[PDB]
């Protein structure tokens, strides 16, 4: 019963240290490639080392000591680190969800934000804000002695008043605010991806049917109008292919579309001349051009699906790692602030506090979702 926290923390230390070091390595390399998400992951990984370097002492506290032999300052410091780890992880997971949202929903509008320098400025603001919000006890020690004990390191059973109000603030602003933002980003991603995909099917069908008619057309007038709509579809698709960062794959798609449009023009003029051979000209040239870009298109579709998976898995991480803790923190605050599982709540609360340390494990996993 009482050995759950120590066992979970030992697991977390053993897994997170190798994996937070590898995560920092990988995120740095991603930054070298000008992937702005490598900055957020680096900020996440360092936060998870900062917490981990404190866990080895808590386990020893639970296994070998009857109290906090380190003194009140080691308790105020470990509390500060714990809270900053939780809110830093939430803030950076939210930042990731909001820049994947912007990347898919507004690929050419906020390009200046999808840059390493912008991500560093954002991380600097996030770090200063989190540190300030959780630094209050460092400027007045009554706060740490109105909230925490100084013979054991836990939050006092009853809550002074301001303690429960700050707990409600952190539940609503710390957890629920960025969580709601992550859910809105996820649905915005689903909508943007489903719309782009659906629009890219409308063009494929108009091209396919117009090619079929050209295949069976007799009068030059119908080949002409079929090519006219083929061209409109090709231009609309290239517009869909035009993105602000000039991704290498998109450049290739643009070149392919240019080749396609040139072939459509060659056929259109051959048809205006009145030579029936346009049927085979277009029926072979457009087929040959489509014969190779389809695999790239499939890779792009998979990429969009993997963004959806990132947003959903990231939400699941926030809801598994932190939901039980903010739920029992809110329940224990709604009690002080109002009028029986109550102690029974206090080891479900402590168990959920220990359970919140698995964000040191989830954070190095996101590496498999970005790339």
């Amino acid at each position: 019963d009482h050995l759950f926290p120590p066992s979970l923390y030992i697991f977390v230390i053993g897994v997170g240290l190798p994996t937070n070091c590898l995560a920092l390595w990988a995120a740095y390399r991603q930054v070298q490639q000008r992937n702005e998400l490598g900055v957020y992951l680096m900020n996440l990984s360092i936060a998870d080392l900062l917490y981990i370097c404190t866990l080895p002492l808590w386990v020893d506290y639970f296994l070998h000591h009857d109290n906090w032999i380190h003194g009140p300052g080691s308790c105020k410091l470990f509390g500060f680190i714990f809270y900053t780890n939780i809110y830093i992880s939430i803030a950076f997971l939210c930042c990731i969800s909001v820049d994947r949202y912007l990347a898919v929903a507004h690929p050419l509008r906020f390009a200046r934000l999808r840059r390493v320098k912008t991500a560093v400025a954002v991380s600097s603001v996030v770090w200063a804000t989190e540190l300030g919000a959780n630094s209050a006890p460092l400027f007045h020690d009554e706060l740490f002695r109105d909230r925490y004990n100084h013979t054991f390191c836990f939050e006092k059973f009853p809550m002074e008043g301001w303690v429960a109000w700050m707990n409600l603030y952190r539940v609503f602003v710390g957890f629920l605010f960025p969580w709601a933002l992550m859910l809105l980003s996820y649905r915005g991603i689903l909508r943007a991806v489903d719309k782009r995909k659906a629009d890219l099917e409308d063009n494929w069908e108009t091209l396919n049917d117009n090619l079929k008619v050209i295949e069976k057309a007799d009068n030059a007038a119908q080949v002409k109008d079929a090519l006219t709509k083929m061209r409109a579809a090709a231009l609309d698709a290239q517009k869909a292919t035009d993105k602000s960062p000039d991704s290498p794959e998109m450049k290739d798609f643009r070149h392919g579309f240019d080749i396609l449009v040139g072939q459509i023009d060659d056929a259109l003029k051959l048809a205006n001349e009145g030579k029936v051979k346009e049927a085979q000209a277009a029926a072979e040239q457009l087929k040959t051009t489509r014969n190779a870009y389809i695999q790239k298109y499939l890779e792009y579709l998979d990429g969009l699906e993997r963004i959806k998976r990132l947003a959903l898995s990231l939400i699941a991480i926030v809801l598994v790692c932190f939901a039980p803790y903010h739920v029992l923190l809110l329940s224990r605050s709604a009690i002080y602030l109002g009028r029986g599982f109550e102690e029974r709540v206090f080891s479900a609360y402590h168990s959920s506090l220990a359970f919140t340390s698995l964000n040191c494990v989830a954070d190095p996993i996101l590496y498999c979702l970005v790339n």
Partner: antibody
Framework: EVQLVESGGGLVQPGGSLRLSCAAS????????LHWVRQAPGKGLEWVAY????????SYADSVKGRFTISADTSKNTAYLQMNSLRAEDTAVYYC?????????????????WGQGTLVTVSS | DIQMTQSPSSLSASVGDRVTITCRAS??????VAWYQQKPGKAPKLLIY???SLYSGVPSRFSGSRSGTDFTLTISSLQPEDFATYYC??????????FGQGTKVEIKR
């Protein structure tokens, strides 16, 4: 300097003919497609004819098919529109315009350069 | 055969006023609609190409956009120099070029 300069307009009797010219400066005739756009007095613009000397491709508006011939001679950097069997309905200001080739901006930018235009008046 | 229809064949507006000219394609046209400004006695000048972008040298007062087959030209604030006939033009292909009938912006009185 980028210029399109029309000449050769004037008065022709019905059934007669004119040869309009479009001289180019700055760019060559072979570097872009040339179009003739017509504007009858008091009317909007009508596309009339096209030539691309880089591919040997021409086309005409239905209203002038078999009546007008469009050609170009890049050695003088000049394009021509041969207007045969003219009808009263062909009275208009004829403008020469420059539209580039696909791919890219020269195509998306369409009639970027227009010449001054020349008047053809067909009357007995 | 791809007809374009401009709705406000004559539009009256004051200097400093907001002007919107709407043009409809008969069929799908990619963002291949250009807008031209013609003043009496002069060849048309290109304002907007690809249903959006300004041609270099054209004042920022001009803008436009596509919504499906509906294209618009907007003059955010008319200057004394903008009272001209504006034309909507479709450019899908060299041989398919068509123009709308044109809309004239008149000085309101």
């Amino acid at each position: 300097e980028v210029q399109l300069v029309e000449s050769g307009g004037g008065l022709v009797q019905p059934g007669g003919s004119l040869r309009l010219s479009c001289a180019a400066s700055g760019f060559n005739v072979v570097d872009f497609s040339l179009h003739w756009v017509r504007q009858a007095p008091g009317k909007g613009l009508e596309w009339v004819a096209y030539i691309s000397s880089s591919s040997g491709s021409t086309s005409y508006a239905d209203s002038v098919k078999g009546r007008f011939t469009i050609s170009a001679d890049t050695s003088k950097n000049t394009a021509y529109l041969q207007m045969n069997s003219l009808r009263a309905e062909d009275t208009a200001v004829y403008y020469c315009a420059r539209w580039g080739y696909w791919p890219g901006e020269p195509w998306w930018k369409a009639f970027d350069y227009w010449g001054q235009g020349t008047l053809v008046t067909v009357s007995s | 055969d791809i007809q374009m229809t401009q709705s406000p064949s004559s539009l009256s507006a004051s200097v400093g006023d907001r002007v919107t000219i709407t043009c409809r394609a008969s069929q799908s046209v990619s963002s291949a609609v250009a807008w031209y400004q013609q003043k009496p006695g002069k060849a048309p000048k290109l304002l907007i190409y690809s249903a959006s972008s300004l041609y270099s040298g054209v004042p920022s007062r001009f803008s436009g956009s596509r919504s499906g087959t509906d294209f618009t030209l907007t003059i955010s604030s008319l200057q004394p120099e903008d009272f001209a006939t504006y034309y909507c033009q479709q450019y899908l292909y060299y041989s398919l070029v068509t123009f709308g009938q044109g809309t004239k912006v008149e000085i309101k009185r």
